[PDB]
Design an enzyme around this catalytic site. Structure first.
Site, PDB file in Angstrom:
ATOM      1  N   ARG A  81       0.853  -1.175   0.000  1.00 35.34           N
ATOM      2  CA  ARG A  81       0.000   0.000   0.000  1.00 35.34           C
ATOM      3  C   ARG A  81       0.888   1.223   0.000  1.00 35.34           C
ATOM      4  NH1 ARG A  81      -5.298   1.395   0.264  1.00 35.34           N
ATOM      5  NH2 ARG A  81      -5.673   3.561   0.835  1.00 35.34           N
ATOM      6  N   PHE A 104       1.718  10.612   1.848  1.00 38.61           N
ATOM      7  CA  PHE A 104       1.143  10.054   3.071  1.00 38.61           C
ATOM      8  C   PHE A 104       2.117   9.051   3.650  1.00 38.61           C
ATOM      9  CE2 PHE A 104      -2.660   7.403   4.777  1.00 38.61           C
ATOM     10  CZ  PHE A 104      -2.426   7.928   6.071  1.00 38.61           C
ATOM     11  N   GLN A 136       3.529   1.311   3.016  1.00 36.22           N
ATOM     12  CA  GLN A 136       3.136   0.299   4.002  1.00 36.22           C
ATOM     13  C   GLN A 136       3.433  -1.105   3.476  1.00 36.22           C
ATOM     14  OE1 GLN A 136      -0.781   0.822   5.600  1.00 36.22           O
ATOM     15  NE2 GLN A 136      -1.088  -1.355   6.029  1.00 36.22           N
ATOM     16  N   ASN A 174      -2.552  -0.769  11.609  1.00 36.32           N
ATOM     17  CA  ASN A 174      -3.445  -1.554  12.431  1.00 36.32           C
ATOM     18  C   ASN A 174      -4.854  -1.479  11.847  1.00 36.32           C
ATOM     19  OD1 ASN A 174      -4.945   0.636  13.676  1.00 36.32           O
ATOM     20  ND2 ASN A 174      -3.056   1.089  14.776  1.00 36.32           N
ATOM     21  N   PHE A 182       4.200   1.030   8.554  1.00 36.91           N
ATOM     22  CA  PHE A 182       4.291   2.018   7.504  1.00 36.91           C
ATOM     23  C   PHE A 182       5.420   2.998   7.829  1.00 36.91           C
ATOM     24  CE2 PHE A 182       2.025   5.709   9.459  1.00 36.91           C
ATOM     25  CZ  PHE A 182       1.322   5.098  10.463  1.00 36.91           C
ATOM     26  N   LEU A 212      -2.653  10.842  12.791  1.00 35.85           N
ATOM     27  CA  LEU A 212      -2.449   9.470  13.199  1.00 35.85           C
ATOM     28  C   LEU A 212      -1.993   9.343  14.658  1.00 35.85           C
ATOM     29  CD1 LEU A 212      -0.864   7.986   9.977  1.00 35.85           C
ATOM     30  CD2 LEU A 212      -3.261   8.249  10.549  1.00 35.85           C
ATOM     31  N   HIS A 251      -1.877   5.174  15.794  1.00 41.86           N
ATOM     32  CA  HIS A 251      -0.800   4.289  15.363  1.00 41.86           C
ATOM     33  C   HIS A 251       0.411   4.569  16.235  1.00 41.86           C
ATOM     34  CE1 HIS A 251      -3.017   3.088  11.818  1.00 41.86           C
ATOM     35  NE2 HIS A 251      -3.538   4.318  11.869  1.00 41.86           N
TER      36      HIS A 251
HETATM   37 MG    MG Z   1      -7.565   3.393  12.411  1.00 43.60          MG
END
Ligand code: MG
Ligand code: MG
Length: 172
Positions: free
Chosen positions: A62, A67, A70, A109, A120, A129, A133
């Protein structure tokens, strides 16, 4: 001393270079130990997945420009899988380190307390985030490799059309 781990990357079977990470084991020791062991493969077979607890041959599945990139889904290669070295998932350890810069290493997650094997690398500040995360490390070298991953053209699920593979990995 904080551990250092590496990935050697290939993009469509063409070597792209090495990424080295420093792991903040003083902040997030359980999280760092999971990632370190997934780099070495030393914990053997995943309990639920029955596949190697090892990033070797795993993909960056990904990629989202501006951004993150991952990877780490060793069992399904698409975000659905993975597992931690502890069996299944483990709890969010610390929110102390902010997602306030590019090239931070953080846990992917699927909700609270669902840390497995997927990780990531940020490519811009991603402060939203924070609290979602766990940041646990940072790139020390190979930033240009990360940028090359980030710029891959992707499919409708943000999966690179090119295979972005961890050819080799380990601890320094
Ligand atoms: Mg989430
Ligand atoms: Mg908790």
């Amino acid at each position: 001393q904080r551990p250092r781990c590496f990935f050697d990357i290939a993009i469509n079977n063409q070597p792209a270079g090495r990424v080295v990470f420093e792991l903040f084991s003083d902040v997030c020791p359980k999280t760092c130990e999971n990632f370190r062991c997934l780099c070495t493969g030393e914990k053997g077979t995943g309990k639920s997945t029955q596949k190697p607890l090892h990033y070797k041959s795993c993909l960056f599945h990904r990629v989202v420009k501006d951004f993150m990139v991952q990877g780490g889904d060793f069992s399904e290669g698409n975000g659905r899988g993975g597992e931690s070295i502890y069996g299944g998932f483990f709890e969010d350890e610390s929110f102390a380190v902010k997602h306030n810069k590019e090239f931070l290493l953080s846990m992917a997650n699927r909700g609270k307390d669902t840390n497995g094997s997927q990780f990531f690398i940020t490519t811009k500040p991603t402060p939203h985030l924070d609290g979602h995360h766990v940041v646990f490390g940072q790139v020390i070298s190979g930033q240009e490799v990360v940028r090359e991953i980030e710029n891959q053209k992707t499919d409708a699920a943000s999966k690179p059309f090119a295979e972005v593979r961890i050819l080799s990995c380990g601890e320094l």
